[PDB]
Amino acid sequence: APPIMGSSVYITVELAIAVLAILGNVLVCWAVWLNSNLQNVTNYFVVSLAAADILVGVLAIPFAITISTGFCAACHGCLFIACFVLVLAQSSIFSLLAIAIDRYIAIAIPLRYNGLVTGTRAAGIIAICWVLSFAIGLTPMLGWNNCGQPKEGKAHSQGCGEGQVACLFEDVVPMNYMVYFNFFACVLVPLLLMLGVYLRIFAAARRQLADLEDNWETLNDNLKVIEKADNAAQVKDALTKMRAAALDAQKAEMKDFRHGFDILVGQIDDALKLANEGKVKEAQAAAEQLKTTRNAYIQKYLERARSTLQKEVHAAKSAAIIAGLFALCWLPLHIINCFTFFCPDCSHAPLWLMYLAIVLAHTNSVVNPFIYAYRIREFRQTFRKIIRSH
Ligand SMILES: CC(C)CCC[C@@H](C)[C@H]1CC[C@H]2[C@@H]3CC=C4C[C@@H](O)CC[C@]4(C)[C@H]3CC[C@]12C
Ligand SMILES: CC(C)CCC[C@@H](C)[C@H]1CC[C@H]2[C@@H]3CC=C4C[C@@H](O)CC[C@]4(C)[C@H]3CC[C@]12C
Ligand SMILES: CC(C)CCC[C@@H](C)[C@H]1CC[C@H]2[C@@H]3CC=C4C[C@@H](O)CC[C@]4(C)[C@H]3CC[C@]12C
Ligand SMILES: CCCCCCCC/C=C\CCCCCCCC(=O)O
Ligand SMILES: CCCCCCCC/C=C\CCCCCCCC(=O)O
Ligand SMILES: CCCCCCCC/C=C\CCCCCCCC(=O)O
Ligand SMILES: CCCCCCCC/C=C\CCCCCCCC(=O)O
Ligand SMILES: CCCCCCCC/C=C\CCCCCCCC(=O)O
Ligand SMILES: CCCCCCCC/C=C\CCCCCCCC(=O)O
Ligand SMILES: Nc1nc(-c2ccco2)c2cc(Br)ccc2n1
């Protein structure tokens, strides 16, 4: 059948993806520009990620449509339009890894986050990652290419000139670069690292929620121990444990919360002094006053601390879904290259499956805007206001 028909479907789908990639991600940038609650270090990597997706529609997809024709071109000029999508993919990987590392620092050392992770440092990391993305993505133009061994028979059949070749991705880009350098080293290793970071994020959230529920249980259990205690020494032991737990909890409205721990520790010292003197019932009476402090202040510190950890877990899930959808969208194309490279006895995957795998990789530049909308209320509400006014 005529090649213009099957290519028309591929081209039409590519252009539809480009439109959606530009529209959705332009909205992400316009949301972060306007709303100050979205202006933070995390979302500066989101903007860098959205910028890469905008460039996929404006340049990469036009490039991909061009290299599918096999048009005559200078080999090094063909390399650039073939490799530019590798630059944008590498930029996305750096932004996805930075987002993960940003969320691990947030939950692992929240007290040192704002001093450690600032906006100026984020902007410099973003600039460095783009320079490295060009270096990694355009490595074939530094000599690791097939321009030295051009397919002259195919170039003659298409009437290409001297120094020109039929511009096709797999004719100019070497497969050992695509499998070993690009996929294994620059894509797969970073993605595995992301997995480990998110594993350490969810493990750190689980341990911190459990510790909160341990401290809360220790206070209530030791209160019951004091109630049913028979001697002052038993009261002393329970209060000594309770004081350490409260001071550890204090380490982890805010003024009204620290005033609650001031009352709690002080109240424990009141009962502890009576216990050391030997006055049991007075110590037990003083220990029951802790319950009023528990209800008014401590239970509020628990429920707010627990809510904050859950909002960090939910945010880390949203970020992990984005990174996971990147892998799902790009892995088919990379897996096909492994078959081409490692199994020379296998038949090359058919042209229609190549186009489908290429289209799937480009579709990843459309999905992030939808994930933010469904999973992040601040982005969702800013999208409504932008769309309504305009
Ligand atoms: C600022 C941005 C938007 C401008 C982008 C310019 C792009 C379109 C330019 C920069 C380099 C150019 C390529 C450089 C060399 C060649 C070899 C020639 O035999 C065919 C055209 C081709 C393949 C060019 C296509 C267009 C190209 C990719
Ligand atoms: C990434 C997740 C979703 C799974 C991806 C699975 C895809 C990429 C795998 C599953 C089965 C694979 C195919 C199995 C058999 C062949 C026949 C061989 O002669 C060419 C490659 C080809 C056509 C493989 C291409 C890649 C393939 C389609
Ligand atoms: C953690 C996961 C996603 C990493 C990616 C798995 C990749 C590297 C694996 C999964 C299936 C594998 C392929 C399965 C079958 C064949 C056919 C064989 O004749 C050559 C190796 C080759 C082509 C393998 C290459 C590597 C491969 C593509
Ligand atoms: C083929 C050439 C490849 C390079 C394409 C780049 C063209 C320029 C397009 C977008 C650059 C965006 C710069 C954004 C400035 C920083 C945003 C900000 O912090 O305010
Ligand atoms: C902001 C929008 C940017 C502009 C995008 C322009 C869309 C270009 C679409 C397809 C480019 C195809 C170029 C021609 C392919 C080579 C044909 C040939 O010479 O054999
Ligand atoms: C042969 C290629 C070798 C690499 C050379 C470098 C090419 C240019 C690379 C990146 C351009 C700079 C983009 C920086 C954007 C950062 C925006 C910001 O946050 O301030
Ligand atoms: C594949 C290409 C790799 C080439 C090696 C890259 C070298 C650059 C590495 C790290 C750059 C770090 C930024 C240093 C600037 C000063 C930072 C600061 O002021 O604290
Ligand atoms: C983090 C995972 C990435 C590292 C995976 C390491 C796997 C080692 C890679 C290759 C091992 C042997 C390759 C076999 C040689 C055949 C090459 C060929 O067919 O041309
Ligand atoms: C999420 C839905 C999952 C289904 C996706 C459907 C897309 C097609 C998937 C695999 C197609 C495999 C085609 C095998 C080509 C074999 C070529 C040959 O004859 O040797
Ligand atoms: N074999 C092959 N791999 C790729 C590719 C890029 C990243 C991973 O794989 C590719 C990309 C475009 Br865009 C067009 C054709 C392609 N062909």
From Swiss-Prot:
GO MF entry, a single one = enzyme binding
| Side of membrane Extracellular, spans | 3-8, 68-78, 145-174, 343-350
Q: How is it modified after translation?
A: Ubiquitinated. Deubiquitinated by USP4; leading to stabilization and expression at the cell surface.
Q: How does it sit in the membrane?
A: Multi-pass membrane protein
Query: Which pairs of positions does the record mark as disulfide bonds?
Result: C72-C160, C75-C147, C78-C167, C343-C346
Where found?
A: Cell membrane
- Report which superkingdom the organism of origin falls in: Eukaryota
Query: Cytoplasmic side of the membrane: what ranges?
Result: 34-43, 102-121, 200-318
GO CC, one annotated term? intermediate filament
Q: Which UniProt keywords apply?
A: Cell membrane, Disulfide bond, G-protein coupled receptor, Glycoprotein, Membrane, Receptor, Transducer, Transmembrane, Transmembrane helix, Ubl conjugation
The positions annotated for binding adenosine are E170, N337, A361, H362
Listed transmembrane segments: 9-33, 44-67, 79-101, 122-144, 175-199, 319-342, 351-374
Q: Which biological processes are named by the entry's GO terms?
A: adenylate cyclase-activating G protein-coupled receptor signaling pathway; adenylate cyclase-modulating G protein-coupled receptor signaling pathway; apoptotic process; apoptotic signaling pathway; astrocyte activation; blood circulation; blood coagulation; cell-cell signaling
Q: Which residues are glycosylated?
A: A155
- Recorded domain comment: The cytoplasmic C-terminal domain is necessary for targeting the non-ubiquitinated form of this protein to the cell surface.
Assembly description: Interacts (via cytoplasmic C-terminal domain) with USP4; the interaction is direct. May interact with DRD4. Interacts with NECAB2. Interacts (via cytoplasmic C-terminal domain) with GAS2L2; interaction enhances receptor-mediated adenylyl cyclase activity.
Please describe what this protein does: Receptor for adenosine. The activity of this receptor is mediated by G proteins which activate adenylyl cyclase.
Q: Which family does it belong to?
A: Belongs to the G-protein coupled receptor 1 family.
Official protein name in the record = Adenosine receptor A2a
| Species name | Homo sapiens (Human)
Q: Which residues of the full protein are shown?
A: 2 to 306 of 412
